[PDB]
Amino acid sequence: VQIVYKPVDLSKVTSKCGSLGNIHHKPGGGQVEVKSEKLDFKDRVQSKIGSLDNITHVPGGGNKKIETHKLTFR
Amino acid sequence: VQIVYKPVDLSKVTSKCGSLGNIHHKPGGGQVEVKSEKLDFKDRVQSKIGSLDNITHVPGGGNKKIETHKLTFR
Amino acid sequence: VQIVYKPVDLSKVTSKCGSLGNIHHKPGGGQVEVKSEKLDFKDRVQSKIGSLDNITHVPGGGNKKIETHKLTFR
Amino acid sequence: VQIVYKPVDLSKVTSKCGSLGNIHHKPGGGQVEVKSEKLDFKDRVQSKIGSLDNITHVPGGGNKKIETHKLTFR
Amino acid sequence: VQIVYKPVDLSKVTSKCGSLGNIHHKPGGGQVEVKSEKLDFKDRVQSKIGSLDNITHVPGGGNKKIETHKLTFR
Amino acid sequence: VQIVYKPVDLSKVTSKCGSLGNIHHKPGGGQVEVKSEKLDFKDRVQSKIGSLDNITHVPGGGNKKIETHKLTFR
Amino acid sequence: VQIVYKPVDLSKVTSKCGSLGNIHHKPGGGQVEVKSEKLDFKDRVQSKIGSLDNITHVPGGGNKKIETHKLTFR
Amino acid sequence: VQIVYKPVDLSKVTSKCGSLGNIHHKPGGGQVEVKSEKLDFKDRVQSKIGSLDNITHVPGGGNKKIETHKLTFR
Amino acid sequence: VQIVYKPVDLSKVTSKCGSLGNIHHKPGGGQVEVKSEKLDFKDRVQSKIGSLDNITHVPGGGNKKIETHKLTFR
Amino acid sequence: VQIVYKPVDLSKVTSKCGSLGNIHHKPGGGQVEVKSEKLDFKDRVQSKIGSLDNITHVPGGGNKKIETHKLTFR
């Protein structure tokens, strides 16, 4: 029983951008009304209730590598 | 019983952009009204209830590699 | 019993863009009204209830490679 | 019993675009009214209920390769 | 019992576009009214109920390769 | 020269209504596009140019008497 | 030369309404686009140019008497 | 030369309303775009240019009498 | 030359309303864009340019009498 | 030359209202953008340029009498 785990990974992620100019985020907010009474969350819940919200994201490169290696022997 | 796991991966993701000009995000917000009473979430729930929301995303390159390697021996 | 897993992968994703000009996202928001009483979510639910929402996405290259390698021995 | 998994993959995805000009997304929002009482979601549900929503996507290249390699030995 | 899996794949997807001019997406929204009471979704449901929605997509190249390789030995 | 102006006017306008029930005015608006260059209005002009508009009028009685008495001696 | 101006006016306007119930005015607005360059208005002009507008009028009685008495001696 | 101006005016305007119930004015606003360059108004001009606007009027009685008496001796 | 101006005016305006209930004015605002360069107003001009505006008027009785008496001797 | 100006005016304006209940004015504001360069106003101009504005008026009786008496001897 011989298991050889040898992932040869050569990877490059490259973003080339000269200049990012005028980014204008001007939002006139509104109205959010939320009515509830009983909220039950047990395990690993991500919940946003009644949000007015503004996200301006300007990453120079925004590159993301996700690598998962799982080996299980039963 | 011999298992040879040898994924030779050579990968390149390349975005070339000179300049990003005028990005204008001006939204006049409105009205969101949500009525509930009983909310039950058990396991691994992602829930957005009653949101007014504004996302401006300007990544220079926006490149994303997702690589999953799973080996299971039963 | 010999299993040789050798995926030779040479892949390139290339986006070349000189300049991105005027992107104008101006939306006049409206009205969203949602009435419920009892919401039950058990496992791995993604749910958006009562959203008014504005997404401006301007990636320089927007390239995404998804690679899944699964080997199972029973 | 010999299994040789050797996918030689040479692939290139190439988008060449000089300039992207005026993109104008101005939508006058309307009205969405949704009435329900009892919602039950068990496993792996993606549900959007009562949304008014605006998506402006201008990727420089928008190239996406999806590669799935599955080998199962029973 | 010898299985030789050797797909030699040489593939190129190429979009050449000089300039993309005026894209104008101005839609006057209307009215959507949806009435239900009991909704039951068990496994792997994708459901949109009561949406008014606006999608402007202008990818520079919009090229997508989908490759699935499945080998099963019983 | 004798002018006797004696209009004996006895007038009654009567509207009897018990109850006015559900009046529902929900119109999905559309699009109006009007192009002109030179507009000249001299005396007593009433002009509506490029209107999208919604009028809900529910008067309890809506009674209107118009009485004009003109006597001219030359 | 004798002018007797004696208009005996007895007038009653009567609206009787018990109750006015549900009046619902929910209009999804649209888009109005008006292009002009030169507008000249001299005397007593009433002009609405490029309006999106919503009027909900619920008068209890809405009764209007207009009475004009003009006597001119030349 | 004898002018007798004796308008005997007995007038009553009467609105009787028990109760005014639910008046709901919820309008999702839209978009108004107006382009002009040169506007010239000399005498007694009433002009609305580029308005998005919402008027909710609920007078208990809304009764209006307009009476004009003009006598001119030349 | 005898001018007798004796307008005997007996007038009553009466609004009787028991109770005014739920008046709900919730408007999701939109977007108004107005472009001009040169505006010339000489005498007695009433002008609204580029307004987004919300008027909720609930007078208990809303009764208005307008009476003009003009006598001119030349 | 005898001018007798004797307007006998007996007038009553009466609004009777028991109670005014829930008046709810919740407006989600939007966006107003106005561009001009040269504005010339000479005599008696009333002008509103670029306003977003909210007026809630709840007078108990809202009764207004306007009476103008003009006598001119040339």
Residue numbers in the entry:
A (entry chain H), B (entry chain D), C (entry chain B), D (entry chain F), E (entry chain J), F (entry chain I), ...: 306 to 379
Quote the study that presented this structure, word for word.
Alzheimer’s disease (AD) is the consequence of neuronal death and brain atrophy associated with the aggregation of protein tau into fibrils. The small molecule EGCG, abundant in green tea, has long been known to disaggregate tau and other amyloid fibrils, but EGCG has poor drug-like properties, failing to fully penetrate the brain. Here we have cryogenically trapped an intermediate of brain-extracted tau fibrils on the kinetic pathway to EGCG-induced disaggregation and have determined its cryoEM structure. Helical reconstructions of all three datasets revealed the Paired Helical Filament (PHF) tau polymorph, while Straight Filaments, a polymorph of tau fibrils usually found in AD at low abundance, were not present in sufficient quantities for structure determination.
As a negative control, we also collected and processed images of AD tau fibrils before incubation with EGCG. Reassuringly, our control map precisely matches previously published tau PHF maps. Three new densities alongside the PHF (Sites 1-3) were revealed in cryoEM maps of PHFs incubated with EGCG for 1- and 3-h. These new densities are not present in the map of our control, lacking EGCG. Moreover, the density attributed to tau exhibits the same backbone path at all time points. Our estimates are based on free energies calculated using coordinates of the control and 3-h structures. The results show that each tau molecule in the fibril is less stable after 3-h EGCG incubation (−28.1 kcal/mol/chain) compared to the no-EGCG structure (−34.9 kcal/mol/chain). In fact, we were able to determine the less disturbed control and 1-h samples to 3.4 and 3.3 Å resolutions.
